[PDB]
Symmetry: D2
Subunit: 80 residues, 4 copies
């Protein structure tokens, strides 16, 4: 009778509860993934930038050891 | 043998400017990707968080409306 | 004299080894990152695609439970 | 009070199509984003992998050219 109305009414309030749970959860995940993602990008971007700078630097150095080892040979000629 | 070496020098010198530029370019793109990428990740996170919101809003309103409806019977059945 | 020419020649031949290793490493990493990413994207795209499917399902069922609970009432009326 | 419940029924029916669509569309986006993300990661890896490669070529050939140049002196000094 009026029994069944108050039931359907309590169910609705709960079957809704559990659906909002599912949505918040999905939203939580989107946030987790999106945060974790951006981070991993920054880290990886940094490493790469780092290694490029080391390439830039280990190169200027090699340049010099040649540039020099060569001006030695020049001298070795112009002299003895 | 002198002029020879004067040359090896000039060669070493200008092979360097070139490889310098290139590395600087890789680094540039390494930058550009990450801002673009992090932009997109953000944009999309938002668009998804938004529709997830709309699902909630839409379902809540239908709850409120439906509750209101069955609340009315609830009174009109308490006597009515 | 000729001593110092084969040194500079073993230098360049070695200093290149080191620069290749460096560039190799970089590209190695670009590889793992992109691979690592694409995985993560697939995994999250899947988990999401999955939770949303659960949301339709868990919704269809809430619907039917309501509909059915309502028709019960509508009948409780038409009869006793 | 039948009509009331005949009404709830119809409301439930119509709320549900709407919430179906919205969840569909959410999922449609989850699909498209991963296609973009994945696609353009891959473009990038390729772009960078290419340039790293060119750094290699540009250096490799400069080495070849320099090697050849100093190989010659080596001969023209191993006699005169």
């Amino acid at each position: 009778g009026v029994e069944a109305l108050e039931d359907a009414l309590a169910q609705i309030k709960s079957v809704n509860n559990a659906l909002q749970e599912r949505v918040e959860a999905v939203a939580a995940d989107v946030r987790t993934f999106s945060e974790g993602y951006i981070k991993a990008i920054e880290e990886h971007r940094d490493k790469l930038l780092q290694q490029l700078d080391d390439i830039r630097i280990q190169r200027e150095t090699a340049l010099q050891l040649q540039k020099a080892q060569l001006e030695q040979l020049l001298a070795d000629m112009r002299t003895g």
